Amino acid sequence: CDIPQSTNCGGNVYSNDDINTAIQGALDDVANGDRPDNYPHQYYXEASEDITLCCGSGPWSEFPLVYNGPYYSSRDNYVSPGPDRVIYQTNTGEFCATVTHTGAASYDGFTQCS
Numbered sequence: 001c002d003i004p005q006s007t008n009c010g011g012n013v014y015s016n017d018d019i020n021t022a023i024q025g026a027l028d029d030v031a032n033g034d035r036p037d038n039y040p041h042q043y044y045x046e047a048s049e050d051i052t053l054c055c056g057s058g059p060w061s062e063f064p065l066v067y068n069g070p071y072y073s074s075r076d077n078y079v080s081p082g083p084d085r086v087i088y089q090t091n092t093g094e095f096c097a098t099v100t101h102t103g104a105a106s107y108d109g110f111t112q113c114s
Contacts, residue, residue, distance in 0.1 A: 001054030001055065001094075001095060001096075002095070003016045003019050003020055003095050004016060004019070007019065007098040007113045007114070008113055008114045009065065009083070009084040009098055009099075009100040009102060009113035010083065010084075010100050010102025010103045010111075010113075011102065012082075012083075012084055012100075012102070014065055014067075014084070014098070014113075018065065018066075018067060018069055019065065019086055019095065019098065021069040021070050022063050022064065022065050022066070022069050022070055022071065022086040023063070023086055023088045023093050023095065024070070024093070025063065025069055025070020025071065025072075026039070026040045026061060026063035026070065026086075026088070027093050028070075029070070036071060036072045036073040036074070036079075037064075037071075037073040037078075037079075037081055039062070039063050039064060039071065039081060040061040040062060040063045041061070041062050041063075042059060042060070042061060042062075042090075043058075043060035043061060043062040043087045043096075044060075045058065045060065046058075050110075050111055050112060051087075051097055051099055051110065051112050052097065052112065053087065053096040053097050054095065054096060054097060055087075055088070055089045055092075055094040055095065055096035055097075056089060056094070057089075058089070058090070059089075059090040059091070060087055060088070060089060060090060060096055061087070061088055061089075061090045062085045062086070062087050062088075062099075063085065063086055063088075064081035064082060064084065064085055064086075065082075065084035065085055065086045065098060066081070066082055066084070083100050083101040083102045084098065084099075084100045084101075084102070084113070085098070085099050085100070085110075086098055087099060097112060097113075098112070098113035099111065099112055099113060100112075100113055
């Protein structure tokens with residue numbers, strides 16, 4: 001769907017530019033064989049009960065959502081991905097959702113941003 005003007009991930013508010021930057025960043029990264037901290041990761045889901053995608057069929061990818069993006073981490077300079085992520089349609093770059101570990105029931109769990 002169209003990138004929202006802003007999104008609230010457990011207190012961290014990101015703009016449409018932060019979101020777009022994450023997706024564009026991830027696509028460029030993949031195109032050049034640079035996968036910072038091994039992201040993007042595949043998003044395996046439609047079975048998900050608390051995450052609603054606003055995009056079509058998979059495959060779906062997930063990449064860290066951060067300020068002054070896009071997220072980047074290097075061989076000798078580790079940078080934490082933080083708790084927030086963007087999910088996009090792998091083959092098209094279509095925005096699907098913003099999710100976060102913040103406010104989830106377990107450390108590895110996710111909830112949708114508002």
